[model samples]
Target: QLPRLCKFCDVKATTCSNQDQCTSNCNITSICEKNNEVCAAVWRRNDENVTLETICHDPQKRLYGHMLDDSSSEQCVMKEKKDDGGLMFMCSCTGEECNDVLIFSAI
Candidate 1:
């Protein structure tokens, strides 16, 4: 069967001092729009631990399944976290509720 569009919630860290201090009050729900598209839980940090952001990835330059040994994405690349502080980006996907996994894991 063809994959159906899932509810997409997009948000980011309001205050990026740290994970706890960061706020993700922002949220928006939309359709996935494409079968190849998947929900992504994006985590980015620079010098401090930033909060997670959930968004829809319409393929192209995004990673699906498993973690990478290194960090960086030509599309949605995953990179290792900086020692002191730099750029860290990671994404994952499984199915419709894949994005929820990230939020659950963090909790």
Candidate 2:
């Protein structure tokens, strides 16, 4: 038998988006900042002054960009001003920490 609402909360099943729907679907936000020194030390590289940036759809300025979209082979990112300020990356599809967000500018 099934309950009338979500087991985790009381959200109605009819109102739910999907089984794996994430909180971010409701206009939530997640962010990641760069720790150049830590990254450099961990990777045996030196990223003294870099900021992390992520974008989808366009290729733009990035200190280090990586494309995680398996559908696309070319490495592309973006850095353009938008209503949200500048290029911003979409939330991860894996629902885990994103490695595509690379060091761009120093913080």
Candidate 3:
């Protein structure tokens, strides 16, 4: 059987400073419009502040042009831009509400 479902949120700022501060206060969840989707999280940090977001995503595809590593299936990993000092932590997992927790061990 497929994964049950996933927590969903588009919060620009979960008031998070990094993966360490990502917490879900979101009261939303998605059954996922498609069967191939997975639980996904996007955490970003810049000079100003940080933001955390989650979604039921299409892992078979790229996210915001950034490709997820194979380790994303089990943990969160760090990704970033080339010309900037910004950093992003992202993950995708095929488990119920897995997006609610991001394990950054691979980073």
TM-score of each: 0.46, 0.18, 0.71
C-alpha lDDT of all candidate models, in order:
0.42, 0.21, 0.62
Model 1: per-residue lDDT, tens digit, 1-107? 44633335544452432232222233555465454566555555555545556566643454433343222222223333333454434443535544433321222
At residue 99, candidate 1 shows an lDDT of: 45
Provide the global lDDT of candidate 2 against the true structure. Answer: 0.21
lDDT of 3 by residue, 48-94 (tens): 76666788876666775665553245544444423156666666766
TM-score, cand. 1 vs. native: 0.46
Candidate 1 off by > 4 Å: 1-11, 14-28, 62-84, 103-107
Give the top-scoring candidate (lDDT): 3
Per-residue lDDT of 94 in model 2: 21
Off by more than 4 A, model 3 = 19-21, 70-85
Which model, 1 or 2, shows the larger lDDT?
1
